[PDB]
Amino acid sequence: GPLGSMEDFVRQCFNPMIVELAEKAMKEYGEDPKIETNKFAAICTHLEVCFMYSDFHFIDERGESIIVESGDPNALLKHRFEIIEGRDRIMAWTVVNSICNTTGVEKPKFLPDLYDYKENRFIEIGVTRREVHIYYLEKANKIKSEKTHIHIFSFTGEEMATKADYTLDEESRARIKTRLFTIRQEMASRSLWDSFRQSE
Ligand SMILES: O=c1[nH]c(-c2ccc(-c3nnn[nH]3)cc2)c(Cc2cccc3ccccc23)cc1O
Ligand SMILES: [Mn+2]
Ligand SMILES: [Mn+2]
Ligand SMILES: [Mn+2]
């Protein structure tokens, strides 16, 4: 079929807020999303996985972790995760500092993606088009915070997480994997997938 434009895909297939946060960050970093389009789509995908990981997960009135997908989470529920990804650098470190003061967890060397108030740890999310184990070791070797939990997703359903501890239930991780499958399938229908996969 005809070859689409990755920019069109990104704008048509990610929520405008995700697209905007990705666009702003690339621009501040000197990278043009109109040129580095495969990177644009990968940054949107990663940011969306961060949001989906956190979606619907609350700490209840008693302090247990519960899932609330309906529109109204009762007012006394607390969001289970803090989202650090998607914030500019100042706000991201401000949040990381606030967490570390509230909880006493030690401060990471690089910005992680999430903080889990139930498991009391920062999380680094990865999304890859290559093998998860090779991607996992790269991430671990970059940060080696050894308290930051690492959770890797691929576009074909494979996952790898620190100490075989996957944090979330299978239904939440299936939502994420189903979304990644949908992204890959739509890219492939637009003949974008080949360039996207090999671009990592
Ligand atoms: O884990 C994280 N990953 C990524 C990430 C980065 C690049 C790509 C990619 N894919 N193809 N080309 N580039 C994918 C994800 C990111 C995004 C990211 C990290 C560092 C500096 C960035 C500068 C500007 C905008 C985004 C930036 C964050 C992650 O936790
Ligand atoms: Mn809320
Ligand atoms: Mn990040
Ligand atoms: Mn990440």
Side-chain angles (χ1 to χ4, degrees):
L3 274 65
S5 123
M6 180 65 82
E7 186 182 354
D8 286 355
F9 171 81
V10 168
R11 291 192 188 286
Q12 290 162 14
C13 293
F14 290 98
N15 178 279
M17 169 186 59
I18 287 169
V19 175
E20 184 177 20
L21 287 170
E23 263 202 275
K24 289 175 181 171
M26 293 185 66
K27 277 178 188 181
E28 276 193 294
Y29 215 79
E31 283 165 335
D32 192 333
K34 306 300 230 316
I35 297 190
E36 292 292 333
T37 58
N38 287 335
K39 167 176 291 159
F40 192 17
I43 291 169
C44 288
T45 299
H46 170 272
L47 179 63
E48 187 174 48
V49 176
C50 291
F51 291 172
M52 291 182 71
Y53 200 101
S54 174
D55 276 349
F56 307 138
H57 285 282
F58 297 88
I59 304 301
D60 62 10
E61 304 154 64
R62 312 167 301 141
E64 312 283 312
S65 72
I66 64 165
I67 303 166
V68 183
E69 292 197 75
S70 64
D72 173 87
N74 112 45
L76 299 182
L77 301 179
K78 175 176 77 166
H79 285 264
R80 168 167 171 180
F81 300 92
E82 203 80 53
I83 302 175
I84 295 150
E85 185 58 76
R87 296 182 188 275
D88 71 32
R89 238 180 245 104
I90 288 170
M91 298 306 306
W93 281 110
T94 296
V95 170
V96 164
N97 284 344
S98 180
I99 289 163
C100 295
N101 292 342
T102 303
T103 73
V105 177
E106 74 173 9
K107 191 175 185 267
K109 291 47 182 176
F110 294 107
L111 290 168
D113 292 315
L114 305 169
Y115 185 80
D116 190 338
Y117 282 111
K118 180 200 179 189
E119 298 278 2
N120 310 120
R121 68 198 177 188
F122 295 99
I123 301 168
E124 176 55 34
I125 296 292
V127 182
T128 183
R129 298 92 89 188
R130 308 174 286 155
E131 275 292 1
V132 295
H133 69 295
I134 289 167
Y135 191 82
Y136 181 92
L137 286 184
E138 290 186 6
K139 279 286 198 204
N141 178 76
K142 177 176 186 242
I143 69 181
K144 183 33 167 54
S145 287
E146 197 166 9
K147 276 172 72 174
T148 298
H149 210 80
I150 298 176
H151 198 138
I152 305 300
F153 299 89
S154 79
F155 283 86
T156 69
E158 288 85 13
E159 300 169 273
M160 176 171 284
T162 299
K163 288 173 181 59
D165 171 352
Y166 286 83
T167 296
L168 305 180
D169 61 294
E170 293 292 317
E171 174 55 48
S172 302
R173 283 152 46 233
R175 288 193 286 270
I176 289 169
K177 295 181 275 194
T178 297
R179 172 58 179 164
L180 294 172
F181 172 82
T182 297
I183 292 164
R184 165 177 182 266
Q185 292 285 292
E186 181 63 24
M187 287 184 176
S189 56
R190 294 171 191 232
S191 305
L192 294 165
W193 170 253
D194 298 335
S195 178
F196 178 74
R197 185 185 63 84
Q198 298 172 30
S199 181
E200 194 178 330

